[PDB]
PDB file of C-alpha atoms and ligand atoms in Angstrom:
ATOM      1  CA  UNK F   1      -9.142 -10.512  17.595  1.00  0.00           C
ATOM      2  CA  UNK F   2      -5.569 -11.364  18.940  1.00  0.00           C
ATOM      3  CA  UNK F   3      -5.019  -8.093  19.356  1.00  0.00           C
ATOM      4  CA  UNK F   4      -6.777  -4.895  19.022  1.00  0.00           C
ATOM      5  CA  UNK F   5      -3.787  -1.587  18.096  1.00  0.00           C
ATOM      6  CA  UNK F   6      -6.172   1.492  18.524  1.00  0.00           C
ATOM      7  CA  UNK F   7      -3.397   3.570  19.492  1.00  0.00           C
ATOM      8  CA  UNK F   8      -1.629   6.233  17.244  1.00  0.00           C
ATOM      9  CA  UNK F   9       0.805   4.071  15.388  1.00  0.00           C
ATOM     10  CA  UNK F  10      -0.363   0.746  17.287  1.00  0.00           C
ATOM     11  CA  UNK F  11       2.277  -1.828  16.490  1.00  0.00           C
ATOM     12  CA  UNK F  12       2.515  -5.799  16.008  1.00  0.00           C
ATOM     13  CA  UNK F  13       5.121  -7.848  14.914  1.00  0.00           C
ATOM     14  CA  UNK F  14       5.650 -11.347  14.530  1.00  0.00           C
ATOM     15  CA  UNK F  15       6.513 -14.170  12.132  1.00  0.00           C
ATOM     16  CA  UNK F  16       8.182 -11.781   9.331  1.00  0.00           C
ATOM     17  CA  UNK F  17       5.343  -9.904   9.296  1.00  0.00           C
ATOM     18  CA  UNK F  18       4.253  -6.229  10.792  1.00  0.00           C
ATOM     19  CA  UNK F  19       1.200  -4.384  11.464  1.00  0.00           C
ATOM     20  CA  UNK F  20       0.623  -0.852  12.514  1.00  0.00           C
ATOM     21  CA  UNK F  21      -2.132   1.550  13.381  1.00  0.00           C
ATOM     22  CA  UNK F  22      -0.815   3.970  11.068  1.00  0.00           C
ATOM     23  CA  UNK F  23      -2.718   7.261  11.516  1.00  0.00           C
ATOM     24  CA  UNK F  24      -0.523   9.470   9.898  1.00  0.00           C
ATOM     25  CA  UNK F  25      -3.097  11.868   9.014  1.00  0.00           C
ATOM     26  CA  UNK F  26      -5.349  12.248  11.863  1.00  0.00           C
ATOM     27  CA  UNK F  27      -4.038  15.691  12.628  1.00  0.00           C
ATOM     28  CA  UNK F  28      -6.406  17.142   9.712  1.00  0.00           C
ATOM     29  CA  UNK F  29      -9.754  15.385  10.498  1.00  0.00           C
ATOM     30  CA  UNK F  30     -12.233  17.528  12.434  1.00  0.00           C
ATOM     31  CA  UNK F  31     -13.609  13.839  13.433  1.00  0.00           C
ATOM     32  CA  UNK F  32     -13.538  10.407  14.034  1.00  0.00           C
ATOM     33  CA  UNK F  33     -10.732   7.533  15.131  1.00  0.00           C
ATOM     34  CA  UNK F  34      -9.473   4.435  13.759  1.00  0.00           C
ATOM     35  CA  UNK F  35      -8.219   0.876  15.533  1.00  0.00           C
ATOM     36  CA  UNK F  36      -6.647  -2.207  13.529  1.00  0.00           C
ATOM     37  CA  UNK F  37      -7.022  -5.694  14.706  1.00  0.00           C
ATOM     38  CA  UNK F  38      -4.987  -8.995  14.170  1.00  0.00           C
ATOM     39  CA  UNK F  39      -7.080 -11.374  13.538  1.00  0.00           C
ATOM     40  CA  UNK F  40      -5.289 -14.424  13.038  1.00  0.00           C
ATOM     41  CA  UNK F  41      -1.552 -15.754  11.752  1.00  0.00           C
ATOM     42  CA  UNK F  42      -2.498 -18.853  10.330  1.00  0.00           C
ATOM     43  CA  UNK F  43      -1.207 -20.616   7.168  1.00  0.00           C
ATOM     44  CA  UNK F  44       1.838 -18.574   7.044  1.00  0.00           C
ATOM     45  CA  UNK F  45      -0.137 -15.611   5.996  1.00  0.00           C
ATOM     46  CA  UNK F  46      -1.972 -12.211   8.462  1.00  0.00           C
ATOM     47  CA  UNK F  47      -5.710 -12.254   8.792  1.00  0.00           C
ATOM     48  CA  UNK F  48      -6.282  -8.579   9.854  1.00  0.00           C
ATOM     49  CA  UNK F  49      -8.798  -5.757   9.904  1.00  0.00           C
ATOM     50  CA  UNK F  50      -9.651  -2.057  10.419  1.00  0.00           C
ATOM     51  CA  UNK F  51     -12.346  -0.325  11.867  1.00  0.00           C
ATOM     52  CA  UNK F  52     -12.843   3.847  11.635  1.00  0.00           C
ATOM     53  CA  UNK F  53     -14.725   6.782  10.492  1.00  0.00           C
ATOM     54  CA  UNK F  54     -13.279  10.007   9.886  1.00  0.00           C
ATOM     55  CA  UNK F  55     -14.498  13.332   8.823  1.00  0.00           C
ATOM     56  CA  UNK F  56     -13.125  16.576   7.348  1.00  0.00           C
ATOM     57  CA  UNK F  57     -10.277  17.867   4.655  1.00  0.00           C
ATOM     58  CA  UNK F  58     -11.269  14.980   2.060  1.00  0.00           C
ATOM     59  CA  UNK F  59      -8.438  15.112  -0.498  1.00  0.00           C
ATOM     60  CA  UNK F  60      -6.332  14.671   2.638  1.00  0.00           C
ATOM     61  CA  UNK F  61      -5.564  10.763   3.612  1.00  0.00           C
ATOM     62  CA  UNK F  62      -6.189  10.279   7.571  1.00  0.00           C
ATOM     63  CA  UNK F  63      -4.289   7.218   7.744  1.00  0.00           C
ATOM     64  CA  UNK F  64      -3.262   3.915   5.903  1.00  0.00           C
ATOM     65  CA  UNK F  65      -2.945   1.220   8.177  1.00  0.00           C
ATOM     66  CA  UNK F  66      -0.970  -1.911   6.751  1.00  0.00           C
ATOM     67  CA  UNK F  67       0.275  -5.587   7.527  1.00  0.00           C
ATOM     68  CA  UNK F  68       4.121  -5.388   6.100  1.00  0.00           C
ATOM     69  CA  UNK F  69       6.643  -8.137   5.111  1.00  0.00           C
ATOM     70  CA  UNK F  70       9.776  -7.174   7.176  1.00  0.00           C
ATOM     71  CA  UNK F  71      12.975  -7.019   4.710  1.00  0.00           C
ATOM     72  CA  UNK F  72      16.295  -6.240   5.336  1.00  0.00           C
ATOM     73  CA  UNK F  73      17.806  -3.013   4.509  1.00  0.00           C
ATOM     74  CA  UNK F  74      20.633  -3.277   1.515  1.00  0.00           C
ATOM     75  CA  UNK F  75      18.875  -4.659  -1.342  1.00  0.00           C
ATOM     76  CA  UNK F  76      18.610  -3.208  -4.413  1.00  0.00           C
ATOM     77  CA  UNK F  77      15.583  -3.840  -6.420  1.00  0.00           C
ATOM     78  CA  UNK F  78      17.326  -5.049  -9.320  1.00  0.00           C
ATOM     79  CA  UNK F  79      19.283  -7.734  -7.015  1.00  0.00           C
ATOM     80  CA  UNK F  80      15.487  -9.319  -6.027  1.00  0.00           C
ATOM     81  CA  UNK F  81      14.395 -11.766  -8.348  1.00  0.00           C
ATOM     82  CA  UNK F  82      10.538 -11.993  -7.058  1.00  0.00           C
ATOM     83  CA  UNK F  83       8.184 -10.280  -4.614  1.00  0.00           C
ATOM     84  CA  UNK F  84       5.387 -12.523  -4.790  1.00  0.00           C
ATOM     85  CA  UNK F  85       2.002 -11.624  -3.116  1.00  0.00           C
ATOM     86  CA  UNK F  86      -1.541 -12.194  -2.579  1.00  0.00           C
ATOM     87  CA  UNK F  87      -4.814 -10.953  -0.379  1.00  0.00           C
ATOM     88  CA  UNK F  88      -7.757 -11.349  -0.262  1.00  0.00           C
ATOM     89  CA  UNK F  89     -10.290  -8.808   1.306  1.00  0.00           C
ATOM     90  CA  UNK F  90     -13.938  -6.951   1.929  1.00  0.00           C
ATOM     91  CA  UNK F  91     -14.767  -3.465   2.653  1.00  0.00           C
ATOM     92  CA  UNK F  92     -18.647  -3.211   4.209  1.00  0.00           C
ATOM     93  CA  UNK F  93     -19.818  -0.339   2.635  1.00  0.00           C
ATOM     94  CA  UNK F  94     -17.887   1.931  -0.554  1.00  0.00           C
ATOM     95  CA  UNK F  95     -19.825   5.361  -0.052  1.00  0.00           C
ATOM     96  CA  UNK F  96     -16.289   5.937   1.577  1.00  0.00           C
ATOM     97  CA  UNK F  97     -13.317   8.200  -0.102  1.00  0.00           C
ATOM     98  CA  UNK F  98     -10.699   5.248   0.633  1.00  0.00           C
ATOM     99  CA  UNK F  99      -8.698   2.825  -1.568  1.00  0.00           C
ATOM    100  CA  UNK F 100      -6.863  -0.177  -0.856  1.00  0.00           C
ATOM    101  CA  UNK F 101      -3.354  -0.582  -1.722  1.00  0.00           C
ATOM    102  CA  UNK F 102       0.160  -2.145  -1.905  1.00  0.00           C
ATOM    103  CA  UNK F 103       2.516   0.422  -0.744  1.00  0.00           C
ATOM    104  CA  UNK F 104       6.295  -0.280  -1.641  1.00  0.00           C
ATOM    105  CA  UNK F 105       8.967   2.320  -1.386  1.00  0.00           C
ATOM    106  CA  UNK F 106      12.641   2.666  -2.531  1.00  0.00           C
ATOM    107  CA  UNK F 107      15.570   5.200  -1.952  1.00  0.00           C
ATOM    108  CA  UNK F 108      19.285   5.427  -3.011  1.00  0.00           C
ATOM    109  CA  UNK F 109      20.095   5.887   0.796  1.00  0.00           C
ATOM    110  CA  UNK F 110      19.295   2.106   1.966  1.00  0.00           C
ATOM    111  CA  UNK F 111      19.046   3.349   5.427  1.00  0.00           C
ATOM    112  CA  UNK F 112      16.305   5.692   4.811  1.00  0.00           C
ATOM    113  CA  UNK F 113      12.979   6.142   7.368  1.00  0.00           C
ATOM    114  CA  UNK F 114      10.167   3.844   6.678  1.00  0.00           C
ATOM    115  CA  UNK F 115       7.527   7.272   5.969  1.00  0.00           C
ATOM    116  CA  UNK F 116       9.113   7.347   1.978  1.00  0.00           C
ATOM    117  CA  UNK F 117      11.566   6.968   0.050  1.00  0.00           C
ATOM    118  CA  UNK F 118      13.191   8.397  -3.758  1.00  0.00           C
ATOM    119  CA  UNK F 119       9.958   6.520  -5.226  1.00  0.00           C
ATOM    120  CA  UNK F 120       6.934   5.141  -4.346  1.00  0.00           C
ATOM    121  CA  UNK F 121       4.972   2.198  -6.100  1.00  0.00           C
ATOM    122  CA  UNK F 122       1.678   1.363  -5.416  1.00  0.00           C
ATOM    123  CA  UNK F 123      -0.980  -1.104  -6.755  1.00  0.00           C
ATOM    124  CA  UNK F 124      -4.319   0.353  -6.128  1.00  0.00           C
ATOM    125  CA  UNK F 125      -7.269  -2.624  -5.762  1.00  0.00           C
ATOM    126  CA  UNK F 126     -10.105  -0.185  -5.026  1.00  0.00           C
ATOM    127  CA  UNK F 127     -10.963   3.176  -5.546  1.00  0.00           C
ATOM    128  CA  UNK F 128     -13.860   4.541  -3.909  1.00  0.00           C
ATOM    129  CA  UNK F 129     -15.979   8.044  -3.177  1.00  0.00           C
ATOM    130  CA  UNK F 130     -14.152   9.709  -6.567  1.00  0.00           C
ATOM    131  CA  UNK F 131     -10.536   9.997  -4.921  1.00  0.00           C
ATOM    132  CA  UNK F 132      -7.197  10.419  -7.392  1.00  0.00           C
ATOM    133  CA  UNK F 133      -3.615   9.232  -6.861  1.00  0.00           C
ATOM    134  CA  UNK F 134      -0.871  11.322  -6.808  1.00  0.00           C
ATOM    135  CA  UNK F 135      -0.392  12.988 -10.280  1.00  0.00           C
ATOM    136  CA  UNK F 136      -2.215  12.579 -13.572  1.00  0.00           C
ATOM    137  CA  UNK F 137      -2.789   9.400 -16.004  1.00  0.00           C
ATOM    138  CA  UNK F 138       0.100   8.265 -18.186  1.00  0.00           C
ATOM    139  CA  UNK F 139      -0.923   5.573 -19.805  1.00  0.00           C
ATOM    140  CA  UNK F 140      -2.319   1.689 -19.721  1.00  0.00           C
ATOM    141  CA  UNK F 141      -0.188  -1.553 -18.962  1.00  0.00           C
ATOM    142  CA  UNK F 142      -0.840  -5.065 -19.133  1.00  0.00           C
ATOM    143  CA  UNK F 143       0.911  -6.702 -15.908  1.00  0.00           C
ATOM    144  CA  UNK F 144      -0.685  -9.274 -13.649  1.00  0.00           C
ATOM    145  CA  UNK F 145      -3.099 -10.554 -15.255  1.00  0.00           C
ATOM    146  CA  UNK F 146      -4.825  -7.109 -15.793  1.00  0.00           C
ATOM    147  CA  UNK F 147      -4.879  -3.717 -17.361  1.00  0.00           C
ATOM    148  CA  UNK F 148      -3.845  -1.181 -15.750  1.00  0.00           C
ATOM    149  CA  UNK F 149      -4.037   2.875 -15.632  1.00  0.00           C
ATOM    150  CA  UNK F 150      -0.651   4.021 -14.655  1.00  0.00           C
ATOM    151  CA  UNK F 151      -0.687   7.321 -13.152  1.00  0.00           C
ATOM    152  CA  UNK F 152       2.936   9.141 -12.314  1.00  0.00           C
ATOM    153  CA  UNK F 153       3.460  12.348 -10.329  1.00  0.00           C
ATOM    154  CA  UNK F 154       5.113  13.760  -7.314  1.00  0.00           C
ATOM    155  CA  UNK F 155       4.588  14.010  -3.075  1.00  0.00           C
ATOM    156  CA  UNK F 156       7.591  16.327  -1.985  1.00  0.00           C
ATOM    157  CA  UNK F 157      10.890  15.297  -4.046  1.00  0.00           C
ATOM    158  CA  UNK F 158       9.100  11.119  -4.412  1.00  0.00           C
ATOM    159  CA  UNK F 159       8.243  10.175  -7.585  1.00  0.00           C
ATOM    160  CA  UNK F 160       4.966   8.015  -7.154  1.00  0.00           C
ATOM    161  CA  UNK F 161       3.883   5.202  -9.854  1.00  0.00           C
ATOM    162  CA  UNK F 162       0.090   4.791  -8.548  1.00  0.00           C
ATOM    163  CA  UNK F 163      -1.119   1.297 -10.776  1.00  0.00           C
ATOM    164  CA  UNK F 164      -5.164   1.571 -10.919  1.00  0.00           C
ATOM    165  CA  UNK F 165      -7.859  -0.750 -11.970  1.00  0.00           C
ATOM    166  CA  UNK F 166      -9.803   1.065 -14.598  1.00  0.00           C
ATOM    167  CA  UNK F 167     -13.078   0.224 -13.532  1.00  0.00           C
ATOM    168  CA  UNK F 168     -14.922  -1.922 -10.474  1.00  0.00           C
ATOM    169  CA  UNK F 169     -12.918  -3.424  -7.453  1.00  0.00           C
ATOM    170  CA  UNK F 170     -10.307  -6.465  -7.229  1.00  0.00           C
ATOM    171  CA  UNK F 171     -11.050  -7.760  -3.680  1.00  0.00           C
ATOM    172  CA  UNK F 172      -9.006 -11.277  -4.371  1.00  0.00           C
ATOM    173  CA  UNK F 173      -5.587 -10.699  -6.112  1.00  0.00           C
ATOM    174  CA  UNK F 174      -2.210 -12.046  -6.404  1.00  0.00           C
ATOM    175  CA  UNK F 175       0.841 -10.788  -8.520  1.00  0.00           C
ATOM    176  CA  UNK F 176       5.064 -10.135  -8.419  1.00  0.00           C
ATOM    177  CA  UNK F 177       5.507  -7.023  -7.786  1.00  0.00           C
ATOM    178  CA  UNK F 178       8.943  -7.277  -9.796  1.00  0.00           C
ATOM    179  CA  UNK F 179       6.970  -7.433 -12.852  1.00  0.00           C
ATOM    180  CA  UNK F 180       5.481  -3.810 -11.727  1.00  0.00           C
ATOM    181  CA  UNK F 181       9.227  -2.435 -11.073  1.00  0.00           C
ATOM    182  CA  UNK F 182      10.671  -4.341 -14.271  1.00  0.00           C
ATOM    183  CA  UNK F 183       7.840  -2.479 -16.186  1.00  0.00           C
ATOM    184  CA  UNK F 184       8.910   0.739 -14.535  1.00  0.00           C
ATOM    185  CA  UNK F 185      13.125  -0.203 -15.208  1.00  0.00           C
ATOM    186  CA  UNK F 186      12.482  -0.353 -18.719  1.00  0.00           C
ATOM    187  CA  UNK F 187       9.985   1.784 -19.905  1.00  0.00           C
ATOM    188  CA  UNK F 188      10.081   4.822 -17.445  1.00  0.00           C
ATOM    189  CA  UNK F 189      13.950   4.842 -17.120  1.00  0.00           C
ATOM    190  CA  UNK F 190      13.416   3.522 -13.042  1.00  0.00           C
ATOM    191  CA  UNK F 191      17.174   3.010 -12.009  1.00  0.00           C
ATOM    192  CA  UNK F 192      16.708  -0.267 -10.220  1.00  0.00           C
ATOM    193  CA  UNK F 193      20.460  -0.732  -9.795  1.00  0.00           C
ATOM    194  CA  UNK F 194      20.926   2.239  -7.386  1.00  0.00           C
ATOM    195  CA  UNK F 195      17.360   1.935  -5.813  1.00  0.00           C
ATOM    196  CA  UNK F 196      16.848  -0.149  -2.329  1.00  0.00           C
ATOM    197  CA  UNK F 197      13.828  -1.731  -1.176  1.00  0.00           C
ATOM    198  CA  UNK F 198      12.504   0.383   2.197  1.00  0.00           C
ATOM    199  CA  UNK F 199       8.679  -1.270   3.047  1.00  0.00           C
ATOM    200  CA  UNK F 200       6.201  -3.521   0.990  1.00  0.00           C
ATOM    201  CA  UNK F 201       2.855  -2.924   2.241  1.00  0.00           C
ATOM    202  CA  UNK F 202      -0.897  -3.638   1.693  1.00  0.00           C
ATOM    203  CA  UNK F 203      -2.989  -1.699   3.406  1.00  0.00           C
ATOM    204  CA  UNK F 204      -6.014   0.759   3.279  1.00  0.00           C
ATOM    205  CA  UNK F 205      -6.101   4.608   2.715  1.00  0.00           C
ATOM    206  CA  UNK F 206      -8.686   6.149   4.686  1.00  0.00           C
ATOM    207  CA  UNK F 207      -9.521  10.080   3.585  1.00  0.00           C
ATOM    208  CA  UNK F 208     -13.411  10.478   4.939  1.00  0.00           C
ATOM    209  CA  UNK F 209     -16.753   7.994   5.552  1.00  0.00           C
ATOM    210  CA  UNK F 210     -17.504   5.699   7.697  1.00  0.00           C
ATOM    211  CA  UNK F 211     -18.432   3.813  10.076  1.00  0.00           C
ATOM    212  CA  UNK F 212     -16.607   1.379   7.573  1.00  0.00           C
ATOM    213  CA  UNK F 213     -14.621  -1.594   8.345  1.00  0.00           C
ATOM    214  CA  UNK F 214     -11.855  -3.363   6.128  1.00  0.00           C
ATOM    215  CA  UNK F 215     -11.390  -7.394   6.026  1.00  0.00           C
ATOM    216  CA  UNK F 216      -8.355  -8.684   4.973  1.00  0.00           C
ATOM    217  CA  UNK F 217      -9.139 -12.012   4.748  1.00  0.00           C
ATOM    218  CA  UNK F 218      -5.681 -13.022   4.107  1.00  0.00           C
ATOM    219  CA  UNK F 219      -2.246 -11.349   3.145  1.00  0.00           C
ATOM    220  CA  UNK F 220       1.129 -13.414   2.366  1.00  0.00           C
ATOM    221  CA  UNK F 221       3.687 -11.838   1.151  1.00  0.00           C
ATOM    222  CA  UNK F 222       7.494 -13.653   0.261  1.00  0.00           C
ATOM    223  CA  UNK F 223      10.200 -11.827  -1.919  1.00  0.00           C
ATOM    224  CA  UNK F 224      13.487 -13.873  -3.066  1.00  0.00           C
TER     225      UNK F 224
HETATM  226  O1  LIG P 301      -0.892  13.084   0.221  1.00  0.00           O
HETATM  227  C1  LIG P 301      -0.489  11.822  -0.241  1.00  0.00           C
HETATM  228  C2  LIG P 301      -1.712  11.089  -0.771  1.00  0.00           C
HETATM  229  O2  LIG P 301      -2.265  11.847  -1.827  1.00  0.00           O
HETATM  230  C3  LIG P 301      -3.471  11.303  -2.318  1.00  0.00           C
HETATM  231  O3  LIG P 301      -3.950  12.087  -3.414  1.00  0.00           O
HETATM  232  C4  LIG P 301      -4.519  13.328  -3.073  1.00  0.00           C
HETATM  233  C5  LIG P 301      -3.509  14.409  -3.477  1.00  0.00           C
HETATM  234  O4  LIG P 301      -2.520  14.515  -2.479  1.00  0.00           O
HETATM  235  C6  LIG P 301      -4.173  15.766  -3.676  1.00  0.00           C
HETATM  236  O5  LIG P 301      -3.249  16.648  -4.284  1.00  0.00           O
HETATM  237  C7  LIG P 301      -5.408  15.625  -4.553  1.00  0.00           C
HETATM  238  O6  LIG P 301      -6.012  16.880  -4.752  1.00  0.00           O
HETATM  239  O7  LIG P 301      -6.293  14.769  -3.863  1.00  0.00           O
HETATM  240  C8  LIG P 301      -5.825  13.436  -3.861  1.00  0.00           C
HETATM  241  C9  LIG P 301      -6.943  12.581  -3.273  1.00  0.00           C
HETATM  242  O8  LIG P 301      -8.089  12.605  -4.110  1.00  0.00           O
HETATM  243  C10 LIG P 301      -3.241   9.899  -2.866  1.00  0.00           C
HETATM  244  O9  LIG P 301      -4.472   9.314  -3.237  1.00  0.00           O
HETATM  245  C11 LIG P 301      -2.533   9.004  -1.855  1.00  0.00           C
HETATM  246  O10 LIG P 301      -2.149   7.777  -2.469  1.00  0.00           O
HETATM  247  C12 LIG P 301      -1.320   9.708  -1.264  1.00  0.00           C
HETATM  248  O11 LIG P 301      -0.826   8.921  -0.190  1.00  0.00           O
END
């Protein structure tokens, strides 16, 4: 690896791109530690990984360590045309309660702290060890290529949209997020023209297992 972030909140940046050691639950596992690597830049995309096992309080997430396309602060979701994507990854083992996920959050206040925002949208390509999103099942939509169970609830005061694959894994994958978020504008009364883009993420969420190690083969990620 280029570099090796096993600190709390471990942090990388370079070439539009970010990547952090984010351990934001660690405080609640009786066990275990976690370290993300960069593993290469090449081909205008991240090649990246994370290592960890963690034990104890298994409905709460330990950490979610993510690459990140850097974006400017200002823009509201309905003034971005595209948010095209892809990645492609492994994980070594799934008798693990984890998932891995894009992580994108908005908020009226454009200045608002990375940690959340009004809403959260996320685009779940794994599921594994029996763990739920945020809320309760709404309903199924065709976006990307795929169907999807949307499931809607709240953390705190956020409204989260959690988009899950109904059954298996999606370990290569490659979609515009603005199709997710015009889905939401129209159909779930998402107010787009007041909202601001805060982080767009992919990254894993790590509640208890291990040792289990996460691949990301390659993430780009472009938005226009
Ligand atoms: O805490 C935020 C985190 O929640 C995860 O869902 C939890 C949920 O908080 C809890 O109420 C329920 O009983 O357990 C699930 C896990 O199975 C959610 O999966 C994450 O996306 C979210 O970041």
């Amino acid at each position: 690896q280029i570099r090796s972030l096993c600190e709390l909140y471990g942090y990388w940046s370079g070439n539009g791109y970010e990547l952090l050691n984010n351990l934001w639950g660690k405080d609640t596992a009786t066990s275990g530690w976690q370290c993300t690597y960069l593993d290469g830049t090449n081909n205008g995309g991240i090649q990246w990984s994370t290592a960890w096992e963690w034990q104890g309080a298994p409905d709460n997430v330990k950490s979610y360590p993510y690459v990140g396309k850097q974006i400017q602060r200002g823009r509201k979701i309905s003034d971005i045309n595209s948010m095209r994507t892809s990645v492609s990854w492994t994980y070594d083992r799934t008798d693990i309660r984890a998932n891995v996920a894009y992580d994108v959050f908005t908020a009226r206040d454009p200045d608002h702290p990375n940690w959340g925002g009004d809403y959260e949208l996320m685009i779940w390509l794994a599921r594994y060890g029996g763990i739920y999103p945020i809320g309760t099942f709404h309903s199924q939509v065709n976006l990307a290529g795929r169907t999807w169970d949307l499931w809607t609830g709240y953390n705190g005061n956020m409204r989260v949209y959690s988009f899950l694959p109904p059954s298996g894994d999606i370990r290569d994958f490659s979609c515009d997020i603005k199709d997710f978020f015009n889905y939401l504008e129209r159909n779930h009364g998402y107010p787009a023209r007041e909202q601001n883009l805060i982080v767009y993420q992919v990254g894993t969420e790590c509640f208890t297992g291990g040792p289990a190690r996460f691949t990301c083969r390659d993430f780009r990620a472009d938005l226009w």
